[PDB]
């Protein structure tokens, strides 16, 4: 959660529709 900004993009394409990274 913390640093919901560009932080956590290390696994964006991964999260997939995780509404967290790529949203």
Swiss-Prot record:
Coiled coil: none
Source organism superkingdom: Eukaryota
Modified residues (Leucine amide): 23
Role played: Obestatin may be the ligand for GPR39. May have an appetite-reducing effect resulting in decreased food intake. May reduce gastric emptying activity and jejunal motility.
UniProt protein name: Obestatin
Recorded name of the encoding gene: Ghrl
Residue span relative to the full protein: 76 to 98 of 117
